Each structure stands twice: as structure tokens, then as C-alpha cells.
């Protein structure tokens, strides 16, 4: 086609939790590093 394209790597990153200690509570939060999370 002789068009020009661009290559950007699809999204990666570490996941990381937020925990207040198990002896305090069991709920955690989860952080996804550098994701514009419209999606999972």
C-alpha cells in the first residue's frame, strides 16, 4: 500500500496492591501502573 504506520508497544506494567495489614482488615486496593483504564 506504501502507507506509513507507527508502532507503539501495547500496554504493560506492574500491578501493585494496597494493603493495610492483615490483622487490621482484609480489604485491599489494586494499582495498575500507567494504564488509561477505560478497560481492565
Amino acid at each position: 500500500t506504501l502507507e506509513i504506520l507507527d508502532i507503539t508497544p501495547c500496554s504493560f506494567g506492574g500491578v501493585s496492591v494496597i494493603t493495610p495489614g492483615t490483622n487490621t482488615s482484609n480489604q485491599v486496593a489494586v494499582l495498575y501502573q500507567d494504564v488509561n483504564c477505560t478497560e481492565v
Binding site: 508497544p9 504493560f12 506494567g13 506492574g14 501502573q33 500507567d34
Partner: peptide, 24 residues
């Protein structure tokens, strides 16, 4: 700030600082 000369491809990640610049 106007006198300095400060992207990822593969596994490289630049975590942001905990204290932002206006906070400092």
C-alpha cells in the same frame, strides 16, 4: 526550571515521584 534538559519501550518504567513539584 527553564535551565534543564530532562519514553518506554520494553520493560522500562519511570515511576513518578511521591512528592510533586508544586508540593516541594
Amino acid at each position: 526550571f527553564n535551565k534543564v534538559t530532562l519514553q518506554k519501550f520494553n520493560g522500562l518504567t519511570v515511576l513518578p515521584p511521591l512528592l510533586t513539584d508544586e508540593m516541594i
